[PDB]
Design an enzyme around this catalytic site. Structure first.
Site, PDB file in Angstrom:
ATOM      1  N   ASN A  90      93.191 -12.866 -32.584  1.00 26.24           N
ATOM      2  CA  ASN A  90      94.459 -12.653 -31.904  1.00 26.24           C
ATOM      3  C   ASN A  90      94.356 -12.815 -30.392  1.00 26.24           C
ATOM      4  O   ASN A  90      94.666 -13.878 -29.849  1.00 26.24           O
ATOM      5  CB  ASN A  90      94.997 -11.256 -32.234  1.00 26.24           C
ATOM      6  CG  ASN A  90      96.310 -10.955 -31.532  1.00 26.24           C
ATOM      7  OD1 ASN A  90      96.842 -11.787 -30.797  1.00 26.24           O
ATOM      8  ND2 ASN A  90      96.839  -9.758 -31.759  1.00 26.24           N
ATOM      9  N   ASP A 189      97.936 -16.467 -30.621  1.00 31.47           N
ATOM     10  CA  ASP A 189      97.566 -15.661 -31.769  1.00 31.47           C
ATOM     11  C   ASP A 189      97.828 -16.461 -33.042  1.00 31.47           C
ATOM     12  O   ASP A 189      98.893 -16.361 -33.647  1.00 31.47           O
ATOM     13  CB  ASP A 189      98.374 -14.365 -31.763  1.00 31.47           C
ATOM     14  CG  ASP A 189      98.134 -13.523 -32.996  1.00 31.47           C
ATOM     15  OD1 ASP A 189      97.066 -13.677 -33.625  1.00 31.47           O
ATOM     16  OD2 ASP A 189      99.013 -12.701 -33.327  1.00 31.47           O
ATOM     17  N   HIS A 345     105.705 -20.811 -35.859  1.00 31.34           N
ATOM     18  CA  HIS A 345     104.470 -21.540 -35.596  1.00 31.34           C
ATOM     19  C   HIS A 345     104.468 -22.744 -36.528  1.00 31.34           C
ATOM     20  O   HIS A 345     105.236 -22.793 -37.488  1.00 31.34           O
ATOM     21  CB  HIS A 345     103.256 -20.677 -35.927  1.00 31.34           C
ATOM     22  CG  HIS A 345     102.655 -19.991 -34.745  1.00 31.34           C
ATOM     23  ND1 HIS A 345     101.943 -20.665 -33.777  1.00 31.34           N
ATOM     24  CD2 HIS A 345     102.649 -18.687 -34.381  1.00 31.34           C
ATOM     25  CE1 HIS A 345     101.523 -19.806 -32.866  1.00 31.34           C
ATOM     26  NE2 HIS A 345     101.938 -18.598 -33.209  1.00 31.34           N
ATOM     27  N   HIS A 379     103.657 -21.212 -29.736  1.00 30.48           N
ATOM     28  CA  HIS A 379     103.864 -21.024 -28.298  1.00 30.48           C
ATOM     29  C   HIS A 379     103.369 -22.336 -27.695  1.00 30.48           C
ATOM     30  O   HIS A 379     102.371 -22.366 -26.977  1.00 30.48           O
ATOM     31  CB  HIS A 379     103.007 -19.868 -27.762  1.00 30.48           C
ATOM     32  CG  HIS A 379     103.377 -18.523 -28.311  1.00 30.48           C
ATOM     33  ND1 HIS A 379     104.559 -17.887 -27.995  1.00 30.48           N
ATOM     34  CD2 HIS A 379     102.719 -17.695 -29.158  1.00 30.48           C
ATOM     35  CE1 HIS A 379     104.614 -16.726 -28.624  1.00 30.48           C
ATOM     36  NE2 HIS A 379     103.510 -16.585 -29.337  1.00 30.48           N
ATOM     37  N   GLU A 404      98.716 -20.137 -22.893  1.00 29.93           N
ATOM     38  CA  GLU A 404      98.516 -18.727 -23.215  1.00 29.93           C
ATOM     39  C   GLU A 404      97.088 -18.326 -22.867  1.00 29.93           C
ATOM     40  O   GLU A 404      96.124 -18.914 -23.362  1.00 29.93           O
ATOM     41  CB  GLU A 404      98.780 -18.384 -24.689  1.00 29.93           C
ATOM     42  CG  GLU A 404      98.595 -16.875 -24.876  1.00 29.93           C
ATOM     43  CD  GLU A 404      99.069 -16.309 -26.197  1.00 29.93           C
ATOM     44  OE1 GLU A 404      99.973 -16.883 -26.841  1.00 29.93           O
ATOM     45  OE2 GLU A 404      98.538 -15.245 -26.570  1.00 29.93           O
ATOM     46  N   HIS A 406      96.102 -14.935 -23.004  1.00 34.65           N
ATOM     47  CA  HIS A 406      96.120 -13.530 -23.397  1.00 34.65           C
ATOM     48  C   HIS A 406      94.785 -12.798 -23.234  1.00 34.65           C
ATOM     49  O   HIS A 406      94.752 -11.654 -22.776  1.00 34.65           O
ATOM     50  CB  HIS A 406      96.603 -13.415 -24.851  1.00 34.65           C
ATOM     51  CG  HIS A 406      97.215 -12.088 -25.179  1.00 34.65           C
ATOM     52  ND1 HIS A 406      97.941 -11.869 -26.332  1.00 34.65           N
ATOM     53  CD2 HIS A 406      97.224 -10.916 -24.501  1.00 34.65           C
ATOM     54  CE1 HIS A 406      98.370 -10.619 -26.347  1.00 34.65           C
ATOM     55  NE2 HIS A 406      97.948 -10.019 -25.247  1.00 34.65           N
ATOM     56  N   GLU A 449     102.185 -14.841 -22.908  1.00 35.04           N
ATOM     57  CA  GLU A 449     101.120 -13.876 -22.639  1.00 35.04           C
ATOM     58  C   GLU A 449     100.001 -14.372 -21.727  1.00 35.04           C
ATOM     59  O   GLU A 449      98.846 -14.526 -22.136  1.00 35.04           O
ATOM     60  CB  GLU A 449     100.558 -13.368 -23.977  1.00 35.04           C
ATOM     61  CG  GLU A 449     101.654 -12.750 -24.851  1.00 35.04           C
ATOM     62  CD  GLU A 449     101.171 -12.230 -26.194  1.00 35.04           C
ATOM     63  OE1 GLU A 449     100.622 -13.018 -26.990  1.00 35.04           O
ATOM     64  OE2 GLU A 449     101.359 -11.022 -26.461  1.00 35.04           O
ATOM     65  N   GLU A 525     110.515 -11.887 -28.615  1.00 34.02           N
ATOM     66  CA  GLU A 525     109.859 -11.439 -29.845  1.00 34.02           C
ATOM     67  C   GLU A 525     110.279  -9.999 -30.161  1.00 34.02           C
ATOM     68  O   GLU A 525     110.243  -9.135 -29.287  1.00 34.02           O
ATOM     69  CB  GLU A 525     108.332 -11.485 -29.706  1.00 34.02           C
ATOM     70  CG  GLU A 525     107.775 -12.817 -29.234  1.00 34.02           C
ATOM     71  CD  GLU A 525     106.255 -12.831 -29.178  1.00 34.02           C
ATOM     72  OE1 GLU A 525     105.689 -13.810 -28.643  1.00 34.02           O
ATOM     73  OE2 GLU A 525     105.630 -11.869 -29.673  1.00 34.02           O
ATOM     74  N   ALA A 527     111.021  -7.064 -33.853  1.00 35.13           N
ATOM     75  CA  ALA A 527     110.979  -6.830 -35.297  1.00 35.13           C
ATOM     76  C   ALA A 527     109.792  -7.556 -35.927  1.00 35.13           C
ATOM     77  O   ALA A 527     109.964  -8.513 -36.679  1.00 35.13           O
ATOM     78  CB  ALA A 527     112.280  -7.294 -35.943  1.00 35.13           C
ATOM     79  N   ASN A 585      87.054 -11.471 -36.036  1.00 38.09           N
ATOM     80  CA  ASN A 585      88.360 -11.944 -36.470  1.00 38.09           C
ATOM     81  C   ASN A 585      89.329 -10.774 -36.476  1.00 38.09           C
ATOM     82  O   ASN A 585      88.915  -9.623 -36.345  1.00 38.09           O
ATOM     83  CB  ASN A 585      88.252 -12.538 -37.873  1.00 38.09           C
ATOM     84  CG  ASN A 585      87.921 -11.493 -38.917  1.00 38.09           C
ATOM     85  OD1 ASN A 585      88.796 -10.755 -39.369  1.00 38.09           O
ATOM     86  ND2 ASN A 585      86.649 -11.417 -39.298  1.00 38.09           N
ATOM     87  N   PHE A 589      96.362  -9.787 -39.355  1.00 40.40           N
ATOM     88  CA  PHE A 589      97.366  -9.887 -38.301  1.00 40.40           C
ATOM     89  C   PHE A 589      97.936 -11.288 -38.113  1.00 40.40           C
ATOM     90  O   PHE A 589      98.820 -11.498 -37.280  1.00 40.40           O
ATOM     91  CB  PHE A 589      96.819  -9.361 -36.972  1.00 40.40           C
ATOM     92  CG  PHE A 589      97.067  -7.898 -36.772  1.00 40.40           C
ATOM     93  CD1 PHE A 589      96.141  -6.951 -37.204  1.00 40.40           C
ATOM     94  CD2 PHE A 589      98.269  -7.461 -36.226  1.00 40.40           C
ATOM     95  CE1 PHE A 589      96.409  -5.588 -37.101  1.00 40.40           C
ATOM     96  CE2 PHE A 589      98.548  -6.100 -36.119  1.00 40.40           C
ATOM     97  CZ  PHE A 589      97.616  -5.160 -36.559  1.00 40.40           C
ATOM     98  N   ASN A 592     102.639 -12.347 -40.252  1.00 38.81           N
ATOM     99  CA  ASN A 592     103.750 -11.554 -39.722  1.00 38.81           C
ATOM    100  C   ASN A 592     105.094 -12.203 -40.067  1.00 38.81           C
ATOM    101  O   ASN A 592     106.102 -11.929 -39.410  1.00 38.81           O
ATOM    102  CB  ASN A 592     103.663 -11.468 -38.192  1.00 38.81           C
ATOM    103  CG  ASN A 592     102.246 -11.314 -37.687  1.00 38.81           C
ATOM    104  OD1 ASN A 592     101.836 -12.003 -36.749  1.00 38.81           O
ATOM    105  ND2 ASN A 592     101.491 -10.405 -38.293  1.00 38.81           N
TER     106      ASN A 592
HETATM  107  C1  IPT Z   1      97.276  -6.856 -30.478  1.00 35.09           C
HETATM  108  C2  IPT Z   1      98.690  -6.495 -30.020  1.00 35.09           C
HETATM  109  C3  IPT Z   1      98.627  -5.210 -29.185  1.00 35.09           C
HETATM  110  S1  IPT Z   1      99.354  -7.837 -28.994  1.00 35.09           S
HETATM  111  C4  IPT Z   1     100.582  -8.553 -30.114  1.00 35.09           C
HETATM  112  O1  IPT Z   1      99.937  -8.999 -31.343  1.00 35.09           O
HETATM  113  C5  IPT Z   1     100.899  -9.569 -32.278  1.00 35.09           C
HETATM  114  C6  IPT Z   1     100.175  -9.995 -33.565  1.00 35.09           C
HETATM  115  O2  IPT Z   1     101.127 -10.485 -34.513  1.00 35.09           O
HETATM  116  C7  IPT Z   1     101.633 -10.793 -31.659  1.00 35.09           C
HETATM  117  O3  IPT Z   1     100.720 -11.869 -31.391  1.00 35.09           O
HETATM  118  C8  IPT Z   1     102.339 -10.323 -30.370  1.00 35.09           C
HETATM  119  O4  IPT Z   1     103.016 -11.409 -29.750  1.00 35.09           O
HETATM  120  C9  IPT Z   1     101.304  -9.727 -29.416  1.00 35.09           C
HETATM  121  O5  IPT Z   1     101.940  -9.273 -28.226  1.00 35.09           O
HETATM  122 MG    MG Z   2      98.825 -13.554 -27.724  1.00 35.21          MG
HETATM  123 NA    NA Z   3      99.898 -12.184 -35.388  1.00 32.52          NA
END
Ligand code: IPT
Ligand code: MG
Ligand code: NA
Ligand code: IPT
Ligand code: MG
Ligand code: MG
Ligand code: NA
Ligand code: NA
Ligand code: NA
Ligand code: NA
EC number: 3.2.1.23
Lengths: 1011, 210
Positions: A90, A189, A345, A379, A404, A406, A449, A525, A527, A585, A589, A592
């Site tokens: 992520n 992510d 995505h 993104h 990005e 992040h 991000e 972004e 919900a 990894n 996550f 989603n």
């Molecule tokens: C690890 C989170 C605090 S950051 C959070 O993780 C999500 C995972 O689906 C998305 O990528 C969001 O955009 C991101 O801000």
């Molecule tokens: Mg990110």
């Molecule tokens: Na995610």
């Protein structure tokens, strides 16, 4: 040189970016958008060889095919072919953070292709090769000679091959590097893959050519008049006989045209552009473009001569629409938009990140079918075809730069560094140069991000200057910085403030009115639909509709990024982070979405569709008021169906055509409803149906619905007294009640109903016991890991408190024989380390009619974390095919996610009562149920329930749905109360207070009988 | 017809348990053929002299949400003090109880009556787990008001100075009570979360000797 470890070199010999070209040599073919012989696709079978690093690549490869290479399909991601593993991380970068260096072991993909070129292409004109997508960097060779270098995995890289091609066979050599300095700007992510994943083609243009063209449309006050301005740029030798004609078409009808020789207006002291020209066409009463009605015109740009000879022709679809922010509102053609969007995505469970038309069309149809009208390119710039489809089907698009960072610390370490401004500028500027002519794109995004850096401000202004027709947004650094025209926070809650230091996430209602703030607010972004989620979705939409400046948002996100793997038996299964040996990894996550990777809908999709409806309703007496939330179209393909039913039993129904102007209202007077005889609750259900099919939906499509409780007649009729009387039998170990061929057994040691008999057949496999926990949802878990526990997460709070460890302790168990029944009274206490968590007091009354009335009163210690549920559960020996119930349905619904469900009589196969979330958890619950039927069993009351072949224990102990196995019989979980599922985000407690079981004392009653 | 509603008996039975007597009742409140509410109760009297009352009420979803769901009676007793473990010491209602504190309160009976010039329901105290008056003690989780004025007299009297103490003490014990509102006093102002719209309600009390 190691150009892949230098942000100062993002390309070598790469041609300038521009809008979609096809170099037609026939005006009619350009107008109809038919294939062009000057644009060839090189997609197909290529030669591929994998290497652990660029230094392992044998020099011979440049001159001839490597005998060890394989023949593979391109476009493709080589991880999907198995040469190396895809990585899912992520935030943390998949490589050591040490800019601008990358691992010495850099997976290298060597692609090659032997092809032939048309004779005429070698003698005249310019032949270029185009790679729409190469992840993440690459060097190009043609016939052994080095051509160029390119970066940015999401935009096309073009090179001139005119001086390299030869008669006969030619050979391309493409060395793709998995990692590069570009990787530092591509930390989205999602799965981390590589390769030539988008189309590859050859484009042949004349030496004197159209090198660029921009289409703009301005309007008068009421949009009844418009002026289309087209700037056309050329390359090659300028001649006085050259001309450019821009024609605008509406079908086969030419509505406007303009012709002129090159030579733009004077711009400064040195003159103007002799190699440019701007055509201006007047268009009266233009048909306006919008997601509601994607009206499009066709613009054909012809480079020709004064005496009528065509040299070249390009073209594009044109949508007449104006986008602007006025007085704090984002307006489309003068009307305030309400964004019903979703982030999407580019993902495919089998092909990875390679996109195809079939999949794109499938997503768009499902999106519009579920009331979405906008999409954010999270993104990065998307496959070119996506914008075409959005232009034609009608979806508002947010085009986002492939930027990005992040994983940096702080998040803006690179974006505030001028050394990285060049690399960043190309990702923004080249995106604009490519997609500026697409009407579907209404907003530009500077990326995602990457904190807030000076580079963002510089690029924000660059866009504002070159393209004032579209607002610019960016969430980094607080969601309301100087680099955004729109307050675009991610996961900001409706009423709850999240006062984070420096970058707080204020309640969206509060954000709008902060001192001095005037901008509109649209969540980029919100919900987070991870697993069983979208709880509280309705809260957002209520706020969106009430507040003018709250103009919607983009749900996160469209589709689960699960990948297909096969077991020893060759059976496919959905895999997530870590399932490919990839480490570190971030596991599940990557999933989603509102729909599964194969596009099968998750239960949450119906909640989104319902809340995003374009028709609102109100009931007053016999009058239903329909209000349209369409801004441009009239309800010209809508029929309203209404139905009245008494506890599922239909009594009356009808239909009326909807004739509502945009923003309008229509009153529908329901005919007199004849008072029902039987007792019960009358329910009114209305649904809007589209009689005619559309380009995105079939005839009969349901677009909206709503329910209301009408008259209710409480039953006062006493039940028919029976003749038989239940007989109580006692022993040191059990209390047994007998009535006819039925028997109920209560264990005096455990205090629970341990068995029931219908004749000589046992009905239970596991005793009926209270249950106060649930197999943790992704939202309950958050980011809590075995090695990194988050004490604040709901699942950790329940664990630490002993909710899963608690053992029932018997306090009382007695039996009494009444006049016409047997009464069993029990009381249990659940403790952990001397602490009493819950107390359950019950009475079981079995009468001569064979019905068992169960009364339950529970006490919950005020200081223990609020329990996930308060109900009963047991394993039935019975395994039936259907499940019939009177309550909310037909789909899975929870307390904070049940607005889409409708009260009625539902009957489905047992399998449908289980939701196959890739990551197993509590699922399939249905609320507001007054009657449940399964096999010979019937339960009545007012409860929530889920029923399946998997126990909460197995769901809780299994990481993947493919490892689940049906247990003996069926597990029934009947709850008097159940906690919300939440979802505002999935990394912190998100269940609103009103959905937490904090009452301290709870009461519920069930009636169990045989039907 | 809430003020005219007539209680119709649907069931009244008696059972003898091992250590107690169990009385079960059911009543329907109707107005012009319409059933407004249904009340089902059980009274369990054990050897300790305690009477456990369980109440489960059904409210027709189409009738306007009721002002309260409780029990009332006129006690023959007239005591000087009122002692309770709940929110206080002053009058407090569901949507106006943040100022009140949970503790043991003891006040003279007169303080349990708020002399609003225009008489109305008054003196309620919420979140009460124990109430003591004379030789009586009520336990549970309820709201209550106690005074020398029946709800009938209060709604038939236009001025407080015209009120007259009735014989004994009127006790109103509510499992649930509607908010009082006030955002304005010329249109409905009780917020939804304080309206009794659940349809089905449950509460239980224990009546015994202090
Ligand atoms: C690890 C989170 C605090 S950051 C959070 O993780 C999500 C995972 O689906 C998305 O990528 C969001 O955009 C991101 O801000
Ligand atoms: Mg990110
Ligand atoms: Na995610
Ligand atoms: C049911 C509509 C939202 S579909 C909508 O109707 C429009 C006419 O009003 C146009 O035909 C659009 O192309 C069509 O998608
Ligand atoms: Mg570089
Ligand atoms: Mg509804
Ligand atoms: Na709004
Ligand atoms: Na219509
Ligand atoms: Na699990
Ligand atoms: Na009065």
């Amino acid at each position: 040189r190691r150009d892949w470890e230098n942000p100062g070199v993002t390309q070598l010999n790469r041609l300038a970016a521009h809008p979609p070209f096809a170099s037609w040599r026939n005006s009619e073919e350009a107008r109809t958008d038919r294939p062009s012989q000057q644009l060839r696709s090189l997609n197909g079978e290529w030669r591929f060889a994998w290497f652990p690093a660029p230094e392992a690549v044998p020099e011979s490869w440049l001159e001839c095919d490597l005998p060890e290479a394989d023949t593979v399909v391109v476009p493709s991601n080589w991880q999907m072919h198995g040469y190396d593993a895809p990585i899912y991380t992520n935030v943390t970068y998949p490589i050591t953070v040490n800019p601008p260096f990358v691992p010495t072991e850099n997976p290298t993909g060597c692609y090659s292709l032997t092809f032939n070129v048309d004779e005429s292409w070698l003698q005249e004109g310019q032949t270029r090769i185009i790679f729409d997508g190469v992840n993440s960097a690459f060097h190009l060779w043609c016939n052994g000679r080095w051509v160029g270098y390119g970066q940015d995995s999401r935009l096309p890289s073009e090179f001139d091959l005119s001086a390299f091609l030869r008669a006969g066979e030619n050979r391309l050599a493409v060395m793709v590097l998995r990692w590069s300095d570009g990787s530092y700007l591509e930390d989205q992510d999602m799965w981390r893959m590589s390769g030539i994943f988008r189309d590859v083609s050859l484009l042949h243009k004349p030496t004197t050519q159209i090198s660029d063209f921009h289409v703009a449309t301005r309007f008068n006050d009421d949009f009844s008049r418009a002026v289309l301005e087209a700037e056309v740029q050329m390359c090659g030798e300028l001649r006085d006989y050259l001309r450019v004609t821009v024609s605008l078409w509406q079908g086969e009808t030419q509505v406007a045209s303009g012709t002129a020789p090159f030579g733009g207006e004077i711009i400064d002291e040195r003159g103007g552009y002799a190699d440019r020209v701007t055509l201006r066409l007047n268009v009266e009463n233009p048909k306006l473009w919008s997601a509601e009605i994607p009206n499009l015109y066709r613009a054909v740009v012809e480079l020709h001569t004064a005496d009528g000879t065509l040299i070249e022709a390009e073209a594009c679809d044109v949508g007449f629409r104006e986008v602007r922010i006025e007085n704090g509102l984002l307006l489309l053609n003068g009307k305030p938009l309400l964004i019903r969007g979703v982030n999407r995505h580019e993902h495919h469970p089998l092909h990875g990140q390679v996109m195809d038309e079939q999949t794109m069309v499938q997503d768009i149809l499902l999106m519009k079918q579920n009331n979405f009208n906008a999409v954010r390119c999270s993104h990065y710039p998307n496959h070119p075809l996506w914008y075409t489809l959005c232009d034609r089907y009608g979806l508002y698009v947010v085009d986002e730069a492939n930027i990005e960072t992040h994983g940096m610390v702080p998040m803006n370490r690179l974006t505030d560094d001028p050394r990285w401004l060049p690399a960043m500028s190309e990702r923004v500027t080249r995106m604009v140069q490519r997609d500026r002519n697409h009407p579907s794109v209404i907003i530009w995004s500077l990326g995602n991000e990457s904190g807030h850096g000076a580079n963002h401000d510089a690029l924000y202004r660059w866009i504002k200057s070159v393209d004032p027709s579209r607002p610019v947004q960016y969430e980094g650094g607080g969601a309301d910085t100087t680099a955004t025209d729109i307050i675009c926070p991610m996961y900001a809650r409706v009423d709850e403030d999240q006062p984070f230091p420096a970058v707080p996430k204020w309640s969206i209602k509060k954000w709008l009115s902060l001192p001095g703030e005037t901008r509109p607010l649209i969540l980029c972004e919100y919900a987070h639909a991870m697993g069983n989620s979208l709880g509280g979705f309705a809260k957002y939409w209520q706020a969106f509709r009430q507040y003018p400046r709250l103009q919607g948002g983009f749900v996160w996100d469209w589709v689960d990024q699960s990948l297909i793997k096969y077991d020893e038996n060759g059976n496919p299964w959905s895999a997530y982070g870590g399932d490919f040996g990839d480490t570190p990894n971030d596991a599940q996550f990557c999933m989603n979405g509102l729909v599964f990777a194969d596009r099968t809908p998750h239960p949450a999709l119906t909640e989104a569709k319902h809340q995003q409806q374009f028709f609102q309703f109100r009931l007053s007496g016999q009058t239903i008021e329909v209000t349209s939330e369409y801004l441009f179209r009239h309800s010209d393909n809508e029929l309203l169906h209404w139905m009245v039913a008494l506890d599922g039993k239909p009594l009356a129904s009808g239909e009326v055509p909807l004739d509502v102007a945009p923003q309008g209202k229509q009153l529908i007077e329901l005919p007199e409803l004849p008072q029902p005889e039987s007792a019960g609750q009358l329910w009114l259900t209305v649904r809007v149906v589209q009689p005619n099919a559309t380009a995105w939906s079939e005839a009969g499509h349901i677009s909206a619905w709503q329910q209301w409780r009408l008259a209710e007649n409480l039953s006062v009729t006493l039940p028919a007294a029976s003749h038989a009387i239940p007989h109580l039998t006692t022993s040191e170990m059990d209390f047994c009640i007998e009535l006819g061929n039925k028997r109920w057994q209560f264990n005096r040691q455990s205090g629970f109903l341990s068995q029931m008999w219908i004749g000589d057949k046992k009905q239970l496999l596991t005793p009926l016991r209270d249950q106060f926990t649930r197999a943790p949802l992704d939202n309950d878990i958050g980011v809590s890991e075995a090695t990194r526990i988050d004490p604040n997460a709901w699942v950790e709070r329940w664990k630490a408190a002993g909710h899963y460890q608690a053992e029932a302790a018997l306090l009382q168990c007695t039996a009494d024989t009444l006049a016409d029944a047997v009464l069993i009274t029990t009381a249990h206490a659940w403790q952990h380390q001397g602490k009493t968590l819950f107390i359950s007091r019950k009475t079981y009354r079995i009468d001569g009619s064979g019905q068992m009335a169960i009364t339950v009163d529970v006490e919950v210690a005020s200081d223990t974390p609020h329990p996930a549920r308060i109900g009963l559960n047991c394993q039935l020996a019975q395994v039936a095919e259907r499940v019939n119930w009177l309550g909310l349905g037909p789909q899975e619904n929870y307390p904070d996610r049940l607005t889409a469900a409708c009260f009625d009589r539902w009957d489905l196969p047992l399998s449908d009562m289980y939701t196959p979330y890739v990551f197993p958890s509590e699922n399939g619950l249905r609320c507001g149920t007054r009657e449940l039927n399964y096999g010979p069993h019937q339960w009545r009351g007012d409860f929530q329930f889920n029923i399946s072949r998997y126990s909460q224990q197995q769901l809780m102990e299994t990481s993947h749905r493919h490892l689940l196995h049906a247990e003996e019989g069926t597990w029934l979980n009947i709850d008097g109360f159940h906690m919300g599922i939440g979802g505002d985000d999935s990394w912190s407690p998100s269940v609103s207070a009103e959905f937490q079981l904090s009452a301290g004392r709870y009461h519920y009653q069930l009636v169990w009988c045989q039907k």
